[PDB]
């Protein structure tokens, strides 16, 4: 039953991701009872909202560096570590995933997590900025673009993808199946058993197609448009790794968190 699979994935999606697209849209449109997020659009507004950014380390976020760009870098990788953990929890709820070889589960996560991260960033973005710290804050696109090189080049391609991706008007029920399709990619490098992975993605793709026809009966070929976004995410990853390598070659004290180092090591 493809509808039962869709509902199962949505239920797991709700359990794994605290800030859904529905909750993010209510915040971005101001149609919610809670107070507005703190807006970070320049150096002064960052200093006033910096201690509200979730960041648990040896010293506070404001003490990470004298440079604003480096403090943004540190706060963002703290979020990324927790994002990987949320996606891992959701991946384990995909029927058949935990029955795969553990080394293949690792491989699917290693290559899938950042593609999922950039997919779900779009849920937290409008054309002018992105929600941070579980919707508590809002960091503008112009501010992220004003950071010195190469820091100012990181977020802009994610905003560009999000503008086009959000035009598809997917909801959380659509996205739950779509991210499962991405995780169960049989062409990841180093996979040991491709066949059982492709068998799962086949059902996920059928469930996705039925979900889009029911939830978007006016969007003809929405399935075809969405499948083309799966390859866009791989280009974003490729561009992202190159920027991280500029950091590794030209910046000093900067070092990725251990979980992120493990993901990027021997990636492609």
């Amino acid at each position: 039953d493809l509808r039962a699979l869709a509902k199962h994935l949505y239920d797991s999606y709700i359990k794994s991701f605290p800030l859904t697209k529905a909750k993010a849209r209510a915040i971005l449109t101001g149609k919610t009872t809670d107070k507005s997020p703190f807006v970070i659009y320049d150096m002064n507004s960052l200093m006033m909202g910096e201690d509200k950014i979730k960041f648990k380390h040896i010293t506070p976020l404001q003490e990470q560096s004298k440079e604003v760009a480096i403090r943004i870098f540190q706060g963002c990788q703290f979020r990324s570590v927790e994002a990987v953990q949320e996606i891992t929890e959701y991946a384990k709820s995909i029927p058949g995933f935990v029955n795969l070889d553990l080394n293949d589960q690792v491989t699917l996560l290693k290559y899938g997590v950042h593609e999922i991260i950039y997919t779900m960033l779009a849920s937290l973005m409008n054309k002018d900025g992105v929600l941070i710290s579980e919707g508590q804050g809002f960091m503008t696109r112009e501010f992220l673009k004003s950071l010195r090189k190469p820091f100012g080049d990181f977020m802009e391609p994610k905003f560009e993808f999000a503008v086009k991706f959000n035009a598809l008007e997917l909801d959380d029920s659509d996205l739950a199946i779509f991210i499962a399709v991405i995780i169960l990619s049989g062409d990841r490098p180093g996979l040991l058993n491709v066949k059982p992975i492709e068998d799962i993605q086949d059902n996920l793709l059928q469930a996705l197609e039925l979900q889009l026809k029911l939830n978007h009966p006016e969007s003809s070929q929405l399935f075809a448009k969405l499948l083309q976004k799966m390859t866009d995410l791989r280009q974003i990853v490729t561009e992202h790794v190159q920027l991280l390598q500029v950091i590794k070659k030209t910046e000093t004290d900067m070092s990725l968190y251990p979980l992120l180092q493990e993901i990027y090591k021997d990636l492609y």
Binding site: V84, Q85, T88, V98, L102, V106, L109, P258, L259, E262
Partner: peptide, 10 residues
């Protein structure tokens, strides 16, 4: 010492 394995086995 894989951190990804630790998250997967939890």
């Amino acid at each position: 010492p894989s951190l990804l394995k630790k998250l997967l086995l939890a």
